[PDB]
Every structure is written in structure tokens, then in C-alpha cells.
Design a protein around this motif. Structure first.
Motif, mmCIF file in Angstrom:
data_model
loop_
_atom_site.group_PDB
_atom_site.id
_atom_site.type_symbol
_atom_site.label_atom_id
_atom_site.label_comp_id
_atom_site.label_asym_id
_atom_site.label_seq_id
_atom_site.Cartn_x
_atom_site.Cartn_y
_atom_site.Cartn_z
ATOM 1 N N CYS A 59 -42.878 -11.452 -14.293
ATOM 2 C CA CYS A 59 -43.234 -10.185 -13.663
ATOM 3 C C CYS A 59 -42.763 -8.967 -14.398
ATOM 4 O O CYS A 59 -43.352 -7.910 -14.193
ATOM 5 C CB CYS A 59 -42.774 -10.154 -12.212
ATOM 6 S SG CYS A 59 -43.485 -11.463 -11.193
ATOM 7 N N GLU A 85 -48.357 -14.936 -10.266
ATOM 8 C CA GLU A 85 -48.682 -13.508 -10.296
ATOM 9 C C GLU A 85 -49.267 -13.067 -11.658
ATOM 10 O O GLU A 85 -49.971 -12.064 -11.714
ATOM 11 C CB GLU A 85 -47.430 -12.652 -9.979
ATOM 12 C CG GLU A 85 -46.855 -12.888 -8.593
ATOM 13 C CD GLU A 85 -47.848 -12.628 -7.476
ATOM 14 O OE1 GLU A 85 -48.478 -11.546 -7.490
ATOM 15 O OE2 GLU A 85 -48.015 -13.509 -6.600
ATOM 16 N N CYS A 124 -40.424 -13.569 -2.609
ATOM 17 C CA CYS A 124 -41.129 -12.424 -2.043
ATOM 18 C C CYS A 124 -40.181 -11.227 -2.024
ATOM 19 O O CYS A 124 -40.597 -10.137 -2.376
ATOM 20 C CB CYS A 124 -41.667 -12.734 -0.643
ATOM 21 S SG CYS A 124 -43.117 -13.823 -0.617
ATOM 22 N N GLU A 127 -39.748 -9.886 -5.598
ATOM 23 C CA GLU A 127 -40.960 -9.223 -6.048
ATOM 24 C C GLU A 127 -41.276 -7.913 -5.347
ATOM 25 O O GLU A 127 -42.308 -7.328 -5.640
ATOM 26 C CB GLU A 127 -42.159 -10.184 -5.972
ATOM 27 C CG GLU A 127 -41.996 -11.335 -6.946
ATOM 28 C CD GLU A 127 -43.099 -12.376 -6.948
ATOM 29 O OE1 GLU A 127 -44.011 -12.281 -6.093
ATOM 30 O OE2 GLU A 127 -43.046 -13.287 -7.804
ATOM 31 N N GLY A 128 -40.400 -7.443 -4.464
ATOM 32 C CA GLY A 128 -40.565 -6.147 -3.818
ATOM 33 C C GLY A 128 -41.104 -6.160 -2.408
ATOM 34 O O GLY A 128 -41.492 -5.102 -1.895
ATOM 35 N N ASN A 129 -41.149 -7.346 -1.771
ATOM 36 C CA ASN A 129 -41.689 -7.506 -0.419
ATOM 37 C C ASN A 129 -43.122 -6.963 -0.303
ATOM 38 O O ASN A 129 -43.465 -6.325 0.686
ATOM 39 C CB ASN A 129 -40.772 -6.878 0.621
ATOM 40 C CG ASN A 129 -39.516 -7.670 0.862
ATOM 41 O OD1 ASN A 129 -38.397 -7.150 0.772
ATOM 42 N ND2 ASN A 129 -39.670 -8.945 1.193
ATOM 43 N N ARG A 130 -43.932 -7.165 -1.339
ATOM 44 C CA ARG A 130 -45.327 -6.729 -1.365
ATOM 45 C C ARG A 130 -46.144 -7.524 -0.326
ATOM 46 O O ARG A 130 -47.029 -6.970 0.328
ATOM 47 C CB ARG A 130 -45.905 -6.934 -2.776
ATOM 48 C CG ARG A 130 -45.197 -6.118 -3.863
ATOM 49 C CD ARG A 130 -45.699 -4.682 -3.915
ATOM 50 N NE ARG A 130 -47.139 -4.623 -4.194
ATOM 51 C CZ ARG A 130 -47.941 -3.635 -3.802
ATOM 52 N NH1 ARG A 130 -47.455 -2.605 -3.117
ATOM 53 N NH2 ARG A 130 -49.234 -3.666 -4.100
ATOM 54 N N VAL A 131 -45.842 -8.829 -0.188
ATOM 55 C CA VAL A 131 -46.453 -9.756 0.769
ATOM 56 C C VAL A 131 -45.332 -10.605 1.423
ATOM 57 O O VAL A 131 -44.188 -10.591 0.959
ATOM 58 C CB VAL A 131 -47.538 -10.670 0.096
ATOM 59 C CG1 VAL A 131 -48.452 -9.889 -0.845
ATOM 60 C CG2 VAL A 131 -46.908 -11.857 -0.625
ATOM 61 N N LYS A 136 -47.883 -15.606 0.030
ATOM 62 C CA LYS A 136 -47.390 -16.020 -1.281
ATOM 63 C C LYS A 136 -47.684 -17.512 -1.542
ATOM 64 O O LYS A 136 -48.191 -17.837 -2.618
ATOM 65 C CB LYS A 136 -45.889 -15.747 -1.397
ATOM 66 C CG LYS A 136 -45.301 -16.116 -2.755
ATOM 67 C CD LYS A 136 -45.786 -15.193 -3.836
ATOM 68 C CE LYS A 136 -44.959 -15.387 -5.065
ATOM 69 N NZ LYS A 136 -45.467 -14.605 -6.229
#
Ligand SMILES: Cc1nn(C[C@](C)(O)C(=O)N2CCN(c3cccc4cnccc34)CC2)cc1-c1ccccc1
Length: 269
Positions: A59, A85, A124, A127-131, A136
């Protein structure tokens, strides 16, 4: 051999690969290394290190592309969470038929599969709590296109299976357990190169200086390599190392005699 020597090693000095078919239990290994009876265990600390390293590689660094082949996946999927990703397609492979059965149960979301939910939530968060977790897992499940038998010791590790040249070949906690000696280790890195595009990525994570590992009372061999021998073998096999990290964190003494772990990202010459 009553634990005096690893399973399947009396005659050769190293656990023969068919021990991974006859005397090997993925469920017992999963419960021991990825389901924790207590907090801040050595096994949990190692898994978080692997997860943050995979997150950084896939990432934050430029490790991207169309196809990633995971060689010697075991019955685990934590090593593919961040990779999904950056890669359009993932092929997961293992020597052990019971490991493959374990992966196909997870892929189908069968109720009897191992539960990766706490690890998925952890990735998650990284990764920034995007989803959230379920979205995921579904993305990774759709990214896994094939589940194949592999054997790193063969010149065609995936047999006759046709695949396009890959952008990445990932191998975590596999090569120390699969290679009985340094020449086999080097040949296995060369065999993996045959699946890779020129300039393709090689991502390897494994234990350092470990002669064995345990699954409860069952002992299995491991190639006791230091960091210099790993670099020399990677360079000799046809790669240029982009980065190499060593951590001093080891597994509990009752699970393995490793002296840390290494992670590396290399490019095929
Ligand atoms: C933790 C931990 N987990 N594991 C992974 C584990 C349980 O060994 C496994 O399931 N594997 C890798 C070996 N693999 C194979 C074995 C024979 C031949 C193979 C030919 N090609 C591909 C794969 C082959 C089959 C899948 C190793 C450690 C560990 C290692 C050293 C020190 C400390 C801990």
C-alpha cells in the motif's frame, strides 16, 4: 522418533515433504499460531509485524500489478489482505492437500472454515478504516482466482498449469520449512523466477536461524539460515534486493528456536 528428531527426518536429516500430507494438521497449526489464548503473545506480535510489513509493501511502496502468485500459502490468508488492494488477480498455492482444503473452505465462506475476522479488522485499521472487515474479506475472496497445488522443489513449481508471467511472487513462512539445504533453497528461488516477469517482484518473509518449529508436540524441520545466507542466495538466484529488514522478535521457545524474522522485496534481473 519420539521428538528426538523432527517428523519425517530420521533418514535424510530434514522433514520429507510427504510428512505435510500424512502427519500434518492445518487446524492444529491455525489454532496454535493464529488464534490466541492470551494477549501480547510472541505469535501475535509476529503476525502484527508481518501484517504491517505487507501493508507497507503493497500500500505504501510501489508493489502493484496484474497477477500475484502466493507460493506456499499454507492454510492462511492474512498474507493476501493488503496485496488484494494492489493486485487484480491472486493465485494461491500450497504443497499440502489439507492446506488446500482449508483455503477452499475459507474461499467458499463455509461455516467450518477458520475465522480470520479479527485479523481482517486489524488490516482494515492499518489501511485507514476505509471499509470494514466483511467488505475487505469479500474483495480478497473475489481476487483469489485459482487455488493450486505447488512444489517449490520442482523446476515447474505449478506443474503444467498455464499462467501469464506474474508481476509478484510472494512466499511467507514457507521456504525454511520446504528447503532441506541451501542448494535446494537457491534452486527454489530460481524455480519461482520462472513464474515471474523480468523486473517482477519477489516478496519473501521467513524465520532466521530456526532448525525446527512445533505444532503442539509435533516437531518439523526448518532450514537454519542467517540473514547473510538469505541475501547471498537471493542475489545468486537472479534478483536484486530493493530492501531487507530483520526483526529480533522470535516465537515462544516452546514453538520454535528462531532468532527473529526477515522480510525482503527483490526484483528479477
Ligand atoms: C509459523 C510457521 N508457519 N509455517 C508454515 C508451515 C506450517 O510450515 C506450512 O504450512 N507450509 C510451509 C511448508 N510447505 C511445504 C513443505 C514441503 C514442501 C513444500 C513445497 N512447496 C511448497 C510448500 C512446501 C507447506 C506449507 C512455518 C513456520 C515456521 C517456520 C520456521 C520457523 C518457525 C516457524
Amino acid at each position: 522418533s519420539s521428538g528426538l528428531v523432527p517428523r519425517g527426518s530420521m533418514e535424510s536429516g530434514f522433514t520429507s515433504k510427504d510428512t505435510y500430507l500424512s502427519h500434518f494438521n492445518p487446524r492444529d497449526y491455525l489454532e496454535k499460531y493464529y488464534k490466541f489464548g492470551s494477549r501480547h503473545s510472541a505469535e501475535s506480535q509476529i503476525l502484527k509485524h508481518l501484517l504491517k510489513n505487507l501493508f507497507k509493501i503493497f500500500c505504501l511502496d510501489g508493489v502493484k500489478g496484474d497477477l500475484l502468485i502466493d507460493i506456499g500459502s499454507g492454510p492462511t490468508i492474512y498474507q493476501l489482505l493488503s496485496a488484494c488492494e494492489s493486485f487484480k488477480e491472486i493465485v494461491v498455492t500450497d504443497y499440502s492437500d489439507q492446506n488446500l482444503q482449508e483455503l477452499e473452505k475459507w474461499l467458499k465462506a463455509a461455516p467450518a472454515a477458520f475465522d480470520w475476522s479479527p485479523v481482517v479488522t486489524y488490516v482494515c485499521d492499518l489501511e485507514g478504516n476505509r471499509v470494514k472487515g466483511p467488505e475487505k474479506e469479500e474483495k480478497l475472496r473475489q481476487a483469489v482466482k485459482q487455488v493450486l497445488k505447488c512444489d517449490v522443489t520442482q523446476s515447474q513449481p505449478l506443474g503444467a498449469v498455464p499462467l501469464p508471467p506474474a508481476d509478484c511472487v510472494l512466499s511467507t513462512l514457507c521456504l525454511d520449512a520446504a528447503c532441506p539445504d541451501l542448494p535446494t533453497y537457491c534452486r527454489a528461488l530460481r524455480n519461482l523466477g520462472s513464474l515471474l516477469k523480468p523486473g517482477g517482484f519477489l516478496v519473501i518473509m521467513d524465520a532466521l536461524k530456526s532448525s525446527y518449529y512445533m505444532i503442539g508436540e509435533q516437531k518439523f524441520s526448518s532450514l537454519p539460515l542467517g540473514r547473510e545466507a538469505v541475501e547471498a542466495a537471493v542475489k545468486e538466484a537472479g534478483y536484486t534486493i530493493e530492501w531487507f529488514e530483520v526483526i529480533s522478535q522470535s516465537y515462544s521457545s516452546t514453538m520454535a528456536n528462531n532468532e527473529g524474522l526477515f522480510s525482503l522485496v527483490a526484483r528479477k534481473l
